[PDB]
Design a protein around this ligand. Structure first.
Ligand SMILES: CCCCCCCCCCCCCCCCCC(=O)OC[C@H](COP(=O)(O)OCCN)OC(=O)CCCCCCCCCCCCCCCCC
Lengths: 89, 80
């Protein structure tokens, strides 16, 4: 299920050809506001533990905005998940 | 113009922090608060206190000098 959640957020780097029509809202707002150079989501698993989260590369003057948008997406997945994005994931 | 991102140029500095939910809000409050307060007051007491000490002495001297200024001089009404 957490993997499906990562599939909702997805990955992005600057060489992606989707433009502003990317299905991920984080990737779409990153392209629209020129915020990040790249981001990715990870679910690293070890024996009954692990790290679930996101890693992004960007310049300095965007960092806080990226964090804000990233956290918003997580809270949206905690509060307002719909069936269409779940099917896509 | 002056916000986070363009304040200073810092190189090779590592900061470590923990969550406030992970650590105590009062970690050894009295046992390290008392010697730290004692150290601060012994580093500042000689600069701070003696002016207020001599204010207390001047205040007491002025009040008692006014009180004996209102006192009747016994040298008067002695000739007759
Ligand atoms: C010569 C210093 C000897 C010190 C011996 C003590 C032990 C020292 C070694 C152990 C360490 C103990 C803790 C140290 C704490 C910090 C260091 C310290 O206290 O240093 C001494 C301090 C600073 O020394 P310094 O400024 O160099 O002296 C010039 C004096 N004008 O200087 C002082 O604290 C002295 C302050 C004296 C102030 C006198 C003020 C008199 C006049 C007050 C007038 C107020 C108004 C009166 C009314 C006016 C109108 C009528």
């Amino acid at each position: 299920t957490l993997q499906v959640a990562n599939a909702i957020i997805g990955h992005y780097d600057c060489t992606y050809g989707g433009g502003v029509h990317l299905s991920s809202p984080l990737a779409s707002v990153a392209v629209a506001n020129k915020l990040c150079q790249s981001f990715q989501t990870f679910n690293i698993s070890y024996s009954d533990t692990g790290l679930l989260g996101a890693h992004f590369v960007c310049d300095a003057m965007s960092i806080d905005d990226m964090v804000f948008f990233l956290q918003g997406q997580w809270m949206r997945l905690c509060t307002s998940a719909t069936e269409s994005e779940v099917t896509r994931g | 113009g002056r916000e986070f991102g363009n304040l200073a140029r810092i190189r090779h500095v590592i900061s470590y922090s923990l969550s406030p939910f992970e650590q105590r809000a009062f970690p050894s409050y009295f046992s390290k608060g008392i010697p730290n307060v004692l150290r601060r007051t012994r580093e500042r007491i000689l600069r701070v206190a003696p002016p207020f000490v001599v204010v207390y002495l001047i205040y007491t001297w002025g009040n008692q000098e006014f009180e004996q200024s209102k006192r009747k001089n016994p040298a008067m009404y002695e000739n007759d």
